[PDB]
Paper text:
The Hanks-type Ser/Thr protein kinase (STPK) PknG and its FHA (ForkHead-Associated) substrate OdhI (Oxoglutarate dehydrogenase Inhibitor) are at the core of a conserved signal transduction pathway that modulates central metabolism in distant actinobacteria. PknG has a unique modular organization characterized by the presence of a highly flexible N-terminal region containing all known autophosphorylation sites and a C-terminal domain composed of tetratricopeptide repeats (TPRs) flanking the kinase catalytic core. To investigate the conservation of mechanisms involved in the regulation of PknG, we studied the kinase isoform from C. glutamicum (CgPknG), which is devoid of an Rdx domain.
To explore the significance of such interactions, we solved the high-resolution crystal structures of the truncation mutant CgPknGΔ1-129,Δ434-822 in two different isoforms. CgPknGΔ1-129,Δ434-822 displayed an ∼7-fold-lower activity against OdhI compared to the full-length enzyme, whereas phosphorylation of the 17-mer substrate was unaffected. The two protein chains in the crystal structure of CgPknG and the two crystal structures of CgPknGΔ1-129,Δ434-822 are shown superimposed.
Residue numbers in the entry: 133 to 152, 160 to 209, 215 to 429
Write the structure that this text describes.
Amino acid sequence: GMVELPFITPKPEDELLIDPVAAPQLVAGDIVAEQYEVLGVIAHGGMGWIYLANDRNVSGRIVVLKGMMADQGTAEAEREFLADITHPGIVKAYNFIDDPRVPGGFIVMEYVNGPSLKDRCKAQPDGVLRVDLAIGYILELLPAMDYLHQRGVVYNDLKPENVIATEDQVKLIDLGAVTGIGAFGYIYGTKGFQAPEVATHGPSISSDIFTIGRTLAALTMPLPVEDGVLAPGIPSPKNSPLLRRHLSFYRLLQRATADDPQHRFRNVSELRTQLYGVLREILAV
Ligand SMILES: [Mg+2]
């Protein structure tokens, strides 16, 4: 139920860093946890700067240092679960470390070398991908979402910017947003992509299904933005020539983003069947 994605050449190592909101707390050459030699920063996020480093213990390995969200037994089990995720469509978690210069500590994860799907969209004149390519990217990441779901776990923050296209693959990079199905407390989704029921009922496979539909919509068509947030709903075929030509695609997007979670696709496999069917229709005509 997957297709062939174009090969995306990774960036050379001498082109991975940006030029440094506040100044970074670490700079090139700094040694973290006596294992990681800092190379620089690759982005500034809500948790502060996100660093790139050499892992000295593993030959050739480049890692990402990202701030962690600041009862040891429970925290130990959650860290071991992240570390043991085996699926190649998900970024690897290598370590969880502290540092006297960064109070919150770092999660140490695999550096995925490639553009995000948002980056690919921004390189187009219409700011969107061709519909067959966007569907192919979603089909490619569905095994990774399902791997989590079948282990009682959800990704919560799927959006074009945390799916990275590398080589002929895509990887999910947002390990920090993962929670158990039905987890209590505040869930770190993104408004405009997150399902409406999460803030009151907790996350579920159905709320992940919702973010997949919003992500696919964002990859393929312009979406109205209100106050920095993608407005709710799917554009109408009356307003979108893409949807008027592919009415089954419009229907799929509405079902995946149904206000009532019970009306959405029940799991990733049900979504894949219809999604691959929409693609074959588009490629047939
Ligand atoms: Mg996130």
